[PDB]
Structures are given as C-alpha cells and as structure tokens.
Ligand binder design. Structure first.
Ligand SMILES: CN(C)CCN(C)C
Ligand SMILES: CN(C)CCN(C)C
Ligand SMILES: [Cl-]
Ligand SMILES: [Cl-]
Ligand SMILES: [Cl-]
Ligand code: NA
Length: 129
C-alpha cells in the first residue's frame, strides 16, 4: 500500500508514534517519506547482505527475520515480511523498540540526513488529526 501523507500521519498517531520517545509526528512522517515514499512494500538490499523492509525500512541485521542474513538477530520477533503489510502495526511496534535503542531516530540514517534539524511539522501541516 502506498499511503497518502495525511493518511499515514493519522495511522501513526493512532498507533502511538506521536511524541514517542519525544519525537513529534512530523519526524516519523518525514522519515517514512525518505525511507519508502510511504510504500509499505518497499524493500532494499544493503551492502552487508541485510535487507530493509517496509514503510520505515527496518533492517534484518537486528530487527526481523528473513532467513537470509547470516549471523543476524530478530529483536522485534517477527518475519520481515510482516513489515510489508498494508496494516502498519508491526512496523510501528518494531520502530518503537528501535528508537528506544539509545540513538533515538539517528538509527534511521535518512532521518538524520534529511529530517533532523528541518521544519518537520510541515509533513503534518494541513492534516486533520
Ligand atoms: C526519494 N525519497 C522519497 C526517498 C527514497 N524512497 C523513495 C525510496
Ligand atoms: C513538501 N513537504 C515539506 C510538505 C508536504 N506536503 C504539504 C506536500
Ligand atoms: Cl511535528
Ligand atoms: Cl537470517
Ligand atoms: Cl532521543
Ligand atoms: Na534477522
């Protein structure tokens, strides 16, 4: 599913991401924009052999199991395929664990490079929330 901007913001709000670990909703919408262009089915292979999955491009080295990342962990306890669902529940639950891991949203390099320090509230401007 490709979410609309305001549709995703609403879905992330319902699932409890708005201000989660102090990150306003616009941060999460910005991150999703640059990670996946709001496409739940986005996948991307990394040079280390891991793969990033879903709307927030969650990586198989630590977070999910895909059966093909040697030596990896599955800390969210999910198949990486669950992160591609039209229902974002799994991606949100896993994102909350990731952002709690010590570096906050710096865990998402695209967040750090494209969102951090910018006017992120623009990503939710105009939405009925
Ligand atoms: C181009 N921006 C939205 C980031 C990359 N996505 C599309 C994969
Ligand atoms: C362009 N970014 C910053 C906001 C998104 N909407 C209003 C198109
Ligand atoms: Cl915001
Ligand atoms: Cl594996
Ligand atoms: Cl933080
Ligand atoms: Na894994």
């Amino acid at each position: 599913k490709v979410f609309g901007r305001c549709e995703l913001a609403a879905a992330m709000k319902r699932h409890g991401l708005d201000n989660y670990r102090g990150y306003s909703l616009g941060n999460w919408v910005c991150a999703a924009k640059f990670e996946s262009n709001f496409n739940t089915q986005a996948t991307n292979r990394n040079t280390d052999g891991s793969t990033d999955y879903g709307i927030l491009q969650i990586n198989s080295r630590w977070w999910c199991n895909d059966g093909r990342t040697p030596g990896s962990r599955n800390l969210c306890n999910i198949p990486c395929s669950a992160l591609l669902s039209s229902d974002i529940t799994a991606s949100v639950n896993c994102a909350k664990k990731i952002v709690s891991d010590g570096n906050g949203m710096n865990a998402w390099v695209a967040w750090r490079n494209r969102c951090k320090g910018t006017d992120v509230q623009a990503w939710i401007r105009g939405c009925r929330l």
